[PDB]
Design a protein around this ligand. Structure first.
Ligand SMILES: *c1ccc([N+](=O)[O-])cc1C(=O)Nc1ccncc1
Lengths: 265, 13
């Protein structure tokens, strides 16, 4: 009765996730592994393979290249932000919250969920790009100049640990609903109807991992730790911004690399 | 100029 209602909440969340996010983890993994119909992604692993890429213009200046990448990738994230907002309205009790608190919770949670979406696109060797038609290597990203080599390596590091948990789309829905309903965000008017939906969401999650991963070991706690890791990736972005502002120049970067980085986050 | 909140607010409505 209590546990039946937990399972039903889990189900409702998963159908509503399926409906809000066309790019599921299962579809990204099919692309990556090779279950795919359509031709495999093109691999970019060096400058020669970069330039043999015409599957995707004007003249950015050294001390703006990075900022313009960051702006570029955030503006390209709007579709993702709208899908997460769509999903969020489906979480029971959400739209019942004070409109101001709905916006607040999305404004913070959206960054963390985006990194969860990125981990789907990653494996230990690299990341899908250009709507899943290309694949950029981890080693090549890391090789690049100046401050750019350290943009993505810490995101890879997280994704590899997060992807080792082997969550599927039905676990991810609940996990994502939990992130959104975080009682601690800055400026929340009423931090308690929020904490109460979350607690209910934690129970369903706890049950979901028992049913779905009956072999596993502290999966629930390991997954709750990742919420902390997600916040740190977001806050680490502020430090990175400082590093750009006073680097030993130059920060030119081939256009096509700029284009590639705007598909990341 | 309209930021992240605005796109969130427009999608909620
Ligand atoms: C967009 C594209 C690439 C990268 N990156 O190489 O680290 C970062 C971004 C980005 O702007 N991410 C971001 C901004 C603000 N909050 C969180 C993440």
């Amino acid at each position: 009765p209590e546990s039946a209602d937990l399972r039903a909440l889990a189900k409702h969340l998963y159908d509503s996730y399926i409906k809000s996010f066309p790019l599921t983890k299962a579809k990204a993994r099919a692309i990556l592994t090779g279950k795919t119909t359509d031709k495999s992604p093109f691999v970019i692993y060096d400058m020669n393979s970069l330039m043999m890429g015409e599957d995707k213009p004007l003249q950015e200046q050294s001390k703006e290249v990075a900022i313009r990448i960051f702006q570029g990738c955030q503006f390209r994230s709007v579709e993702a932000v709208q899908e997460i907002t769509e999903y969020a309205k489906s979480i029971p009790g959400f739209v019942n919250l004070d409109l101001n608190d709905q916006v607040t919770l999305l404004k913070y949670g959206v960054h963390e969920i985006i990194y969860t979406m990125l981990a789907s696109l990653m494996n230990k060797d690299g990341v899908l790009i250009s709507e899943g038609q290309g694949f950029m290597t981890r080693e090549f990203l890391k090789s690049l100049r100046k401050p750019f080599g350290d943009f993505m390596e810490p995101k890879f590091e997280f994704a590899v640990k997060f992807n080792a948990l082997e969550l599927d789309d039905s676990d991810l829905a609940i996990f994502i609903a939990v992130i959104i309903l975080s009682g601690d965000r800055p400026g929340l008017l009423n931090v308690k109807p929020i904490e109460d939906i979350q607690d209910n969401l934690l129970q369903a999650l706890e049950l979901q991992l028992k049913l779905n991963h009956p072999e596993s070991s502290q999966l629930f706690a390991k997954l709750l730790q990742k919420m902390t890791d997600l916040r740190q990736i977001v806050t680490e972005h502020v430090q990175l911004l400082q590093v750009i502002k006073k680097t030993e120049t130059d920060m030119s970067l081939h256009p096509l690399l700029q284009e590639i980085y705007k598909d990341l986050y | 100029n309209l930021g992240l909140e605005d796109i969130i607010r427009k999608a909620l409505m």
